[PDB]
């Protein structure tokens with residue numbers, strides 16, 4: 001009766017982690033899958049893109065990671081009945097430093113999500129652009145990791161270090177961690193490197209790469225400024241189509 | 256004759272920090288200003304975009320942060336005589352954990368790097384998308400901070416947290432730290448919000464915002480795959496022109 005915990009990870013900055021976390025979560029919630037979106041990035045963009053931002057640590061994931069507060073007390077409503085959010089704080093930067101000298105440092109999120117595991121169908125964890133303790137808590141809590149891979153050079157160059165870190169995680173912190181898949185993002189057919197990224201990544205990772213590609217689409221960058229996922233901003237747009245298709249692929253794997 | 260140390264900082268991921276670091280540095284070096292580019296990001300994109308990439312720690316800034324190695328030993332040549340690089344390692348991820356329990360952890364870069372201003376006109380530090388100990392080292396070492404601001408909503412939303420954190424560094428770690436300027440980047444003139452970001456940022460920060468705006472430009476995203484700054488890849492590109500103009504703006 002337990003749902004699936006998926007972390008959205010890539011230490012390269014600006015590759016579509018949060019756009020993916022928000023729009024995947026909203027797609028699932030629109031299909032009446034109970035979905036929780038947990039923002040583990042100090043920047044707090046997953047919460048902000050859904051109209052949620054907290055003035056201090058109260059009501060944020062920080063309280064569950066360091067202060068033993070039940071995550072049940074930290075659920076925030078959204079415009080979708082089946083989507084709740086646990087938001088971040090910039091104080092998560094300090095939390096990562098505080099956790100270095102604490103016990104069970106990598107399992108704070110894993111342990112905090114236990115009281116909810118069978119209350120949600122999906123728990124989506126948005127990661128910051130880093131491989132530090134916030135991202136490691138996400139990877140240690142997740143059943144699977146979904147890698148958004150921007151179709152540009154620096155993102156491609158960093159993929160090996162990300163998969164190496166996932167392999168290290170499977171050697172101890174979380175042996176059961178599975179690759180949900182690599183999602184090609186921010187694709188632009190006019191850029192010849194974009195085509196090379198698609199070919200190389202599909203060539204090597206094959207069925208670990210999602211069939212759907214997320215195109216560069218200005219509507220995806222507009223909707224967070226209105227605090228809306230793309231399905232509530234411009235449902236016709238190709239970007240919203242891409243994330244609905246991703247949602248359908250994941251829900252197939254749970255039928 | 257003492258050079259200027261400029262930190263390129265923005266905790267938002269993917270706003271043009273590295274593209275600015277590389278291409279500002281290469282513009283300055285092309286004008287025969289002695290320039291050193293230090294990569295403080297575990298991703299190591301600043302070095303990679305200039306043809307310098309490695310996984311191991313030897314020769315990287317790791318050794319100056321944790322092993323007391325002089326930065327003078329870590330200088331790597333580029334295709335520009337006046338541009339050297341001190342590269343990163345992915346093991347800076349582990350370094351940032353190790354720094355937590357190090358005496359004077361915030362000043363490791365300052366103590367090792369400030370002396371090199373006697374030998375360089377400009378020292379440019381590329382920061383990772385974070386406000387943790389690597390970025391704080393860069394801010395505590397610098398004379399000034401240059402903020403690249405992508406003309407999209409999340410980057411704008413992050414600006415007040417960034418300036419708040421820079422103020423906190425100024426008050427507690429580096430009282431002389433100055434604003435080099437805000438650089439509007441990745442600007443798409445056909446995007447309504449891009450114009451709104453420009454207008455809001457110029458309205459609040461006024462002349463602290465550079466006149467030059469870096470436009471979205473496909474060649475700027477291509478040249479790192481060849482290990483080349485845009486001045487050595489497509490000098491006929493408006494991306495190249497923007498960063499040459501930025502260099503002229505500073506050199507003034």
Ligand SMILES: Nc1ncnc2c1ncn2[C@@H]1O[C@H](COP(=O)(O)OP(=O)(O)OP(=O)(O)O)[C@@H](O)[C@H]1O
Pocket residue numbers: 012013014015016017018019020041043045127128129185186187214215216217218219220221222224239266267268269384407408409410
């Ligand atoms: N497919 C897309 N088309 C157009 N713009 C996009 C697309 N995906 C993301 N963006 C925009 O590009 C920027 C970077 O995306 P986003 O913030 O989701 O990346 P991220 O990996 O979460 O970044 P960070 O490393 O800061 O967490 C944002 O301003 C976002 O709105």
Ligand SMILES: Nc1ncnc2c1ncn2[C@@H]1O[C@H](COP(=O)(O)OP(=O)(O)OP(=O)(O)O)[C@@H](O)[C@H]1O
Pocket residue numbers: 011012013014129152153154155267268269270271272273274275296298300382383384440441442469470471472473475476477479494
């Ligand atoms: N003006 C531009 N036009 C087009 N592409 C650009 C431009 N500036 C940067 N890019 C590309 O956008 C991506 C993000 O830029 P870049 O990596 O320089 O940002 P960053 O802030 O250094 O990222 P990170 O947070 O990961 O350090 C890269 O693939 C880069 O090549």
Ligand SMILES: [Mg+2]
Pocket residue numbers: 017018019041045046127128
């Ligand atoms: Mg994000």
Ligand SMILES: [Mg+2]
Pocket residue numbers: 272273274296300301382383
């Ligand atoms: Mg960078």
